Amino acid sequence: CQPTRFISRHNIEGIFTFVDHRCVATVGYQPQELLGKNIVEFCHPEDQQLLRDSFQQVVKLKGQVLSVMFRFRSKNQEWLWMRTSSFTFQNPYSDEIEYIICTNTNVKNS
């Protein structure tokens, strides 16, 4: 059974700058409802600081994967557990600011 997931790209502040249309099946929003908002805006209040701190650390981890689990508000206003696996990318031919690539999976908290 294929887990339901979609990819996103964020600036280092957490703002969605690219959203894969698989998000509609995973969380119910159109990409345009996510683009330009901070992922923290969709995060349960108990998990917000964790998710902020995860974005802050993934840039210190030399491009390695950092995972975080948190509750994401779906378009139906319900809390879905998500496991986001993120890592930074920087094109080595450039000195452009790195950005963060995430894969966002709906998972069980069991």
Partner: protein, 109 residues
């Protein structure tokens, strides 16, 4: 001349390198529509002379979790090859899929 973002595209793969997702950026670069790639192994697109090196690169990714491919050639939809380099990362669970950031190093040749 193209700016960095316009020569980069993300792809996602199962562990056998079949495409499970591809960014629409690939269309301007290489000609493919994402939907025609789904279910095709990436290895179908690698130049013959890069095949043995990409096999080794895949084994390194599966063992280590992350890899940089080094330069290789990818077949474009309307013939020709482009040079690319790819950073691959395995996404593991509680391996699930491979995430590729692909950067084009050349015009179709």
């Amino acid at each position: 001349f193209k700016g960095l973002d316009s020569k980069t595209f993300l792809s996602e793969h199962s562990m056998d390198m079949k495409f499970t997702y591809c960014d629409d950026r690939i269309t301007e670069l290489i000609g493919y529509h994402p939907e025609e790639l789904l279910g095709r192994s990436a290895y179908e697109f690698y130049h013959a002379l890069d095949s043995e090196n990409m096999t080794k690169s895949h084994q390194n990714l599966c063992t280590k979790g992350q890899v940089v491919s080094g330069q290789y050639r990818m077949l474009a939809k309307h013939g020709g090859y482009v040079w690319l380099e790819t950073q691959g990362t395995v996404i593991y669970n509680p391996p699930q899929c491979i995430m590729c950031v692909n950067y084009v190093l050349s015009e179709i040749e």
